[PDB]
Symmetry: D2
Subunit: 462 residues, 4 copies
């Protein structure tokens, strides 16, 4: 084999060295650490275990840290008892956190609820199970009409479609979590509930302040506001996580398929990695095979053009982690097999021409020299049949490229000249097993240029 | 709006005249009668009610009859108690129907079980919940090794991947059911578990014997054998029902997406209508909105190029029938909106040229004269932006065209000449509301030809 | 096969019925009568002879009347002797026609010479052999500086590049010649030295006043002014005669190839017939085989996409008339053979383009077209179909005129009352034409329920 | 700028340094020395004069030696008087060179005339003016039936269409002329009447024996036999001279345009230089402006895609040498201006095609190419780039030869040791050439770690 990359959330069932080794064997490329749960010691040991496996086997994975993020939630109910809300009733939210709730009123965690909402706005509670219309806003109370019957439990999610929420990018938790990722040298940070350009900036400025200027920020698009500000969010991020399940809560359901497709398309166009996540193989938490619906949705995200797909509970807490990775890997291989190149700046011209040439000469391999990974990602843009071997002296870059579709990173000593790159690239092509005596390879690099620019393509026979 | 057509299975919640009228308003095009259940009186009254609504409102629907078909099933268990089968155990099937089962053995309904199976074959029970390997075949017994733990209830489905089953197309039930459809003048027969070309032939020869030579046979592809013989099944059928859920039971799960896509593609190429069915909006049996996964799978089947999508329990027995039709209709409209024409025999040349011309002159409407419906279906092949108005003197043809994507049938008195067709077609274009003074329309017909051939295209301004 | 049509100028050598019959055999499609020479009796008899032959053999040709036009010429010299003009000298033109000329001065035929020129203009004499710059205009004198050495003979042609000459399109001779054309029922008038849109209108109004509203005007582009106004001229004409040799006198020589190609392209896009004329096979006036350059030039005009090519002296006065027509037809057949169709808002365009695209997709040898005025046959030809075009018309003028359009075979028929009748009879006539046979596919193009001038219907039939 | 290259034949009128300097100014790229005439001293001095001018002005030209070749000719007549041969008569050629001829018989220069002909063959005399069919061959006589009337003068050329003449490619004169070419270090040899692959080999082996293995052979296709064997000839040659006038004598006249076009197309596909020659601007031997047909023919050869065009008498003996070069260069500039690139297994092809596609996508005025042998500069030219090609070479012969290739500017340089050094210095030389400026994009093409003859690298730089 597959070209599509696999992110796996690691949890108790899969955190050991033995289990991680079997995970990589099955097709895992990137370890996701979900900082909604666990403490620094647990997560630190997962990091150590994977690096132990990496060092022992010579395999390369990346580590992605997923922030908890800022969420609005209902709070507590009398006795912790669910309550039945009836369509048509008045129901009131209050910013007063001291308030334990009941069928007429509940507290919400967000002090700005009375500010950002207006009469006529929609309030969705518990993954959009219960809908409500704001009818009045008085003091600390948001007064509403309940639009549909539903049962209210404690501590449920609140969604405010088409209302801009004035929550900061980072909780105090997330600030400390991000420093830990810097100390640990993670390759990616995935930021939850990105709403706008400034959210991404705040994250970048926090990481630069702790030696993480090279950590790639993957913005999670999880709601209406993020989708609306997607272009500026993309421009500020290094990649995108499309979280269909969360987004589905806030936008018309028929629109979600086309939001996913749009976002993947724009990421590809931008040379920025994209992960398709949530509701992938959830049924395998309890079952050893996925549903038909599950396999088809994943394959369609790969056809949409995703770089990577993600497992969540399936691999973290589920009974059948290895099985989920394997069938995910099979769906990737089956679907990648049948995709084609898309051939439609100097960098674009050269990389596009390099893939077209590769295809015309039936080259199994495009070999690329990259410091930061841009040129490997510029080639990936055109969905080459050929595998991409990215040679870099930068270890972070080598890890990050693991996430990009169809890229095999390779770490090397600094290469001093273009002709040296051809000599060594040719040898590394053979040593990689990705090509053999007689095969043609296309070699992409930057000669006499500021990094960030790729301007040279060269054809060699091994 | 939409062009994609909606089949609805009608049941108790939706059988009344009032309900059917609201169903058509919401987007239903074709009534499906599922003859797995109900008796002739129930089904007869559903037919009558829809014709009453049709006559009152002037709206046009079609009636499709869905046969129960031949299935292999396990039978009875001692006391009707589920039993736990353990991986590794021996378990034996017997063709002896007198046998009430237990954890070591059960009877199967099919006498040919001992014939068609061989040592090493796989036996799947209950939608593939429990797998088993045949180890020996002695007398009336098929001896097996249980491959995975599972619980066996009574009367469960048996699947025999990659084994040809020697069951006839028709049960005695289905023969009588088909005569009833002929007596009632249904527009379509959907035949369950079509395995091969001869199954379709047997159905055709039964219908011709009862005055149903004009009833279109829609073959249901529900298993490995049908998929393997798909080309000959297509050649013999009038259209195809792709039943992903059933097919999923028998073939590798990663393959199902590509089987669906292949089948839709070949049907389009063949000018034969195709329905995408099962596991569409099942969650709406109990819930007023679909899941994100559900909406995305449906939209992807429309992008694959399906003529029609089908609701099953959602509309027959579910709490929220009208809601399911409406959101299905919204997904059609949203997805159809963004599809494009596909422009790549005399008939093909003319119809393809007619759509290309229509698109070049920005024609909102292609007007077609058809006796049997072929020429309307030949135009539909190229996914025109323009709506197709099919003028026919044949009432059955008018009903059947309701299923074809983007076709608005219209019944007319016989049209005696090509120039008469232009005169009247122009007036009917205006009366339809589909086009206005000044619009261009393209008019497709057969002049001086044996029916089955379309050879003339003409541009007129209304 | 050939598709390209051949215009032949008829003169003493080719005016007999015997000769015209052999000319048609060899490939002549259209008789050009050049009204620079001969009187009405000669021309009347050429017309009669061809119609006799047409009547006897059943063959169809068209008749084109080519006007002499307005020419400016120098006049006579002392003793009838040439004079040698030296670069640098003063030289003077005078409108005084009594003046017998010499190395300092000569008369010109055009009394408005002193009006239409200005100081600094260039005067070209004898097909641009001698060039001169105007330095002063005094009374009846245009005083000039001779730009290059040369010998001036008597009665030589004068060209005034980028000077608008203020003469009407038609001289007295030309008005009378066109009245004769109306009397004779000619199919085409080719008008000399068309300079601007109003010239075409003057001719249109003249022909209409004398019953010739249905005669097609072919405007001859022969100079800078015509070329500059080429768009408005094409728009007003029915077709164009590209007269490369005359154009060559007035514009930079490297530009003539591109003027020819541009003018042909635009005529094709306009659905209007174009003839490539002048300096085709001239060497064959004296010789039975053309030069390599000659045959190469004609073929390149055909590849440029001209409807027709024209013989001049070669076929009128020269020693090898039939040979010139014959090798011209071979060059046509050899060059048409290797050309391809060109597939590229309007209903008529969409339908005709599609009819050719279908023809080629179904390998159809024949496209059958119904026409009243010839427009629809010309819209199909625009796309250079492989198939021959069989044009059915009840209009005789249209039947004749279409003989000039590339790849078109006209057929006169009784009125066809309906589209389906057009298919029935169209099929029968396709077989009778020999252009197609049982089993062939033909594409049939017509207008159903439309104002004539609009083509909106295409239909595929097996014979 | 122009891209098309100009070959000029030098003779008495153009052999001085003054004249060659003005010729270069006007657009001459390559001096043709025609060894049909002049002796070694004249030719030696023409070579010296051009190198003096080249040395003084820093301009680069190439030198091409054109052999006379093997000709068959009739010989003398009684009294030196023409004789009139009448269609139908018997007429006899004799290999007996003592025979002074008359209206019944004339001698031919080729002793193998009686061997290589057969009954039924056609004999063409005086550029095909008179044709004859062989009826009998007896002893030293080839007895013929005259097919058409004509007048036979003395010493006229004989053509034998579709008869393989059994003479070697090189006569005694030609072997000596090529030895002189090696002595003079000429860049090209153009060999007359190349008929088959072995002819090219005989020349290749001769030049190699005399230190001329690096001299490029341009085979002249001048007859039917050469044309029939054209593929094997191109494969063995470095380039082709399309001699339309001579070809015209032997093949049907309507075929010559298509022979020219086919031969140019195939040379372009082969990465091999092609010259279009003979009957370009001949009228300018006597006249200071060409005919319209002449200028149209040259431009059509350029649009066909020739690398170079050739002046003959126009520039050697004629009265208006500089004028002919000048208007030839204008026709080049006017015609190259409006041409487009042509984008269409091999590594070298893929890379070069891509380098032009990139150049055009990035609006690059210059493609800079590194070459030892000239192959890679010629592979880029194959696709008719808008950009000028700047070819860097350490090889002087290659620097001269590339002057004939369309759109190529050679530059001699010190050896370049690495690909990155090729970029550094390539950029500097692009600015110094004037062909590009600060901010322009250039595409740079070379071979990295490959056998010379292979081009595999393309790189985009901003100056």
């Amino acid at each position: 084999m597959k070209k599509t990359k696999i992110v796996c959330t690691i949890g108790p069932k899969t955190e050991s060295e033995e289990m991680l080794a079997k995970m990589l064997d099955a097709g895992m490329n990137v370890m996701r650490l979900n900082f909604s749960h666990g403490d620094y010691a647990e997560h630190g040991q997962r990091i150590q275990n994977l690096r132990n496996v990496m060092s022992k086997t010579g395999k390369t994975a990346a580590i992605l840290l997923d922030t908890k993020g800022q969420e609005i939630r209902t709070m507590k109910l009398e006795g912790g008892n669910d309550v039945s809300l009836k369509a048509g009733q008045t129901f009131t939210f209050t910013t007063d956190k001291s308030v334990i709730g009941n069928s007429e009123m509940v507290a919400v965690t967000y002090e700005g609820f009375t500010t950002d909402l207006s009469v006529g706005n929609t309030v969705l509670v518990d993954d959009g199970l219960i809908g409500m219309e704001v009818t009045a806003i008085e003091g600390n109370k948001v007064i509403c009409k309940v639009l549909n019957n539903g049962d209210l439990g404690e501590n449920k999610g609140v969604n405010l479609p088409g209302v801009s929420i004035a929550l900061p990018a980072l909780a105090e938790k997330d600030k400390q979590d991000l420093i830990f990722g810097c100390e640990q040298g993670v390759d990616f940070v995935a930021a939850s509930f990105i709403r706008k350009r400034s959210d991404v900036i705040e994250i970048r400025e926090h990481l630069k302040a702790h030696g993480g200027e090279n950590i790639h920020i993957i913005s999670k698009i999880e709601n209406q506001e993020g989708l609306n500000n997607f272009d500026e969010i993309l421009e500020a991020s290094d990649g995108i996580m499309v979280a269909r399940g969360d987004l589905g809560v806030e936008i018309p359901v028929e629109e979600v398929i086309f939001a996913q497709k749009m976002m993947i398309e724009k990421c590809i166009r931008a040379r920025k990695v994209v992960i398709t996540a949530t509701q992938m193989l959830d049924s395998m938490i309890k079952n050893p095979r996925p549903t038909r619906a599950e396999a088809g949705d994943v394959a369609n995200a790969i056809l949409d053009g995703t770089d990577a797909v993600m497992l969540s509970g399936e691999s973290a807490k589920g009974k059948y982690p290895l099985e989920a990775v394997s069938i995910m890997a099979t769906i990737c291989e089956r679907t990648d097999r049948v995709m084609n190149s898309r051939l439609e700046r100097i960098t674009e011209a050269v990389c596009r021409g390099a893939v077209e040439t590769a295809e015309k000469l039936d080259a199994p391999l495009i070999v690329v020299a990259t410091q930061g990974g841009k040129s490997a990602r510029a080639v990936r843009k055109y969905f080459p049949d050929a595998t991409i071997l990215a040679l870099t002296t930068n270890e972070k870059t080598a890890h990050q490229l693991v996430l990009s579709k169809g890229v095999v990173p390779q770490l090397v000593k600094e290469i001093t000249s273009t002709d040296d790159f051809y000599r060594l690239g040719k040898e590394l092509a053979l040593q990689s097993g990705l090509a053999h005596k007689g095969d043609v390879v296309v070699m992409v690099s930057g000669a006499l240029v500021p990094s960030g620019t790729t301007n040279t393509a060269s054809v060699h026979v091994l």
